[PDB]
């Protein structure tokens, strides 16, 4: 019957939408890898920033290492 053949033909009309859905799925699986690599980027580039920005970005936890040299002069 024409009706059934029409339904079967039309079953795949929306190919592009299904492909967009596929884009969404694979990117959802992939994108969390940005966190490891982001941490490492920041790890490497932290000692390049100004001392003030190092102190700020760590909420004051980070401070200049104390190795027993270059102390104040009376």
């Amino acid at each position: 019957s024409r009706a059934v053949y029409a339904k079967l033909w039309a079953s795949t009309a929306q190919y592009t939408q299904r492909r967009h859905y596929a884009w969404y799925q694979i990117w959802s699986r992939v994108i969390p890898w940005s966190v490891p690599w982001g941490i490492f980027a920041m790890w490497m580039v932290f000692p390049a920033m100004p001392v003030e920005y190092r102190q700020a970005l760590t909420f004051g936890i980070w401070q200049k290492p104390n190795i027993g040299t270059h102390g104040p002069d009376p």
Binding site: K7, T12, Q14, Y15
Partner: peptide
């Protein structure tokens, strides 16, 4: 004795109404 077959006559119909009797089918 052969069975007494019932007749089924041909009739022509509007496809857009026959399409309301088609089962639902999905591939995507």
């Amino acid at each position: 004795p052969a069975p007494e077959y019932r007749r089924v006559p041909f009739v022509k119909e509007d496809m857009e109404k026959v399409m309301e009797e088609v089962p639902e089918f999905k591939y995507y």
